[PDB]
Design a protein around this ligand. Structure first.
Ligand SMILES: *[C@@H]1O[C@H](CO)[C@@H](O)[C@H](O)[C@H]1NC(C)=O
Lengths: 48, 48
């Protein structure tokens, strides 16, 4: 009687999870803002 | 010995006492897959 090393079942898929740490830029939220300025008084926002 | 006789305490009444003893004649048959323990299924470890 021989104990043969049967294969380990191969994982079929990958799952990744991780907290994004940095907050979302939310560029769309500021671009979707309905109170859009005129080119004379163009608004400026810095996404850093 | 007083007059050639010795003082001895001889039982006048008895019982049977039971005493259980366990003697180990066997142990779990541990089997180790040496390659799967050491390397699991990682080819670089199996090569080393
Ligand atoms: C022996 O001891 C048992 C229990 O202690 C008792 O029931 C019995 O009568 C005794 N017999 C004699 C002859 O002492």
């Amino acid at each position: 009687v021989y104990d043969l090393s049967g294969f380990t079942v191969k994982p079929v898929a990958t799952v990744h999870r991780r907290i994004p740490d940095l907050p979302d830029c939310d560029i769309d939220k500021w671009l979707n803002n309905f109170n859009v300025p005129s080119p004379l008084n163009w608004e400026r926002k810095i996404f850093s | 010995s007083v007059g050639g006789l010795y003082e001895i305490k001889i039982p006048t009444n008895f019982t049977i006492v039971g005493q259980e003893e366990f003697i180990q004649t066997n142990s779990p048959k541990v089997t180790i897959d040496c390659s799967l323990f050491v390397c699991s299924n990682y080819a670089a470890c199996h090569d080393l």
